[PDB]
Amino acid sequence: IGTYRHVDRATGQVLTCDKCPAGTYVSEHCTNTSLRVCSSCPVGTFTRHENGIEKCHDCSQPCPWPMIEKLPCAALTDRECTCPPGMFQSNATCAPHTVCPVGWGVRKKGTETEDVRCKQCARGTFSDVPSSVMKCKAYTDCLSQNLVVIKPGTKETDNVCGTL
Template sequence: LFCSVVVGISARVLNTTSPADPALLSPRQYQHTDPDSGTQLDCDKCPAGTHVSLHCSLTAVRECSRCPEGTFTRGENGLQKCHPCRSPCPGGFVEKATCKPTQDRVCTCPTNSFLSGAGGTECKPHSLCPPGTRVRRRGSETDDVVCKPCTKGTFSDSSSLKCRTHTICHAQGLLTSGTRETDNVCRPLSTSSAKPFTTTPLPGPAKAVLLQEPSSATPPSALSGPVHEGQRPSS
């Protein structure tokens, strides 16, 4: 009983198919022709990060080996050799993903720059939207910034993600109308129309009255009083 079970499993794993009927091939299998018998076999693929080191046969399943350093395979495969990784990133680029058995090396442009040039051979900084425009679409690793003019009633006087609304002049009145690049300029407030600034004194203690002292130059007669007729001042 045990032997019959093993034979049954082997028959399913190593099932042969006709070349005229490829639809029966599983996506997790690849076809291989056995060199000894000439039979076409459906072999199981090897997992990502490995490759087929020995194909399946009528009596054995396939064998897998890990990808050597500097090579990779992304998914299940029937490859006899792994793919070589890309060369180290050139100057001006940064390594986004390292080379390892399950993935290739990925080089990209630094932050705030994008891939440009013929065949994407250089990195250029993202453009700055000029005055009068705003950012419509931010830049990415592969595309530059896309700008869009400010709509009526708005402006931008420097590189900006969005446009600002023109200032509304109320009491002052409008001196100069704004544009897509400049804001409205309002008239300055008139000094004649401004109310005088007054203050009301706060109640407080009464101020002391300053009495003037008599002058030392006052004549003596004024101090001794009037002199009566016929009377002389005593000596």
């Protein structure tokens, strides 16, 4: 654990104290006959690193709805805000991801910062349900099924498999 220099009030001696671990602050500095005492950051405050400071840093303001916390305000971390799942950040706030319609599928997964990116299903694949999450799905293989294709698929429906 690292150290910091401190000027002792009563004697003017410059001492080398031990740092206080992340999550605490120095509540009494060392002196020439006593070790420094660390205390834990009071609720509302944090420090991220081992430090020599006398107050913890204040956590930021509560997340503006509809944003939520993906990290809390705790001794070691400031709160950190995010658009909840299924939404993404645009300018001001959060907007719901695009829903890819039937016949389209997710090319790129939506995130907290970017919207979903849809593509039309490629030949041989289909998507039969609106979804901001699902990918185009390969037709059932009628060959490797023993069967043959009774009805072709479309970008919206699987091909139907059978015989005769």
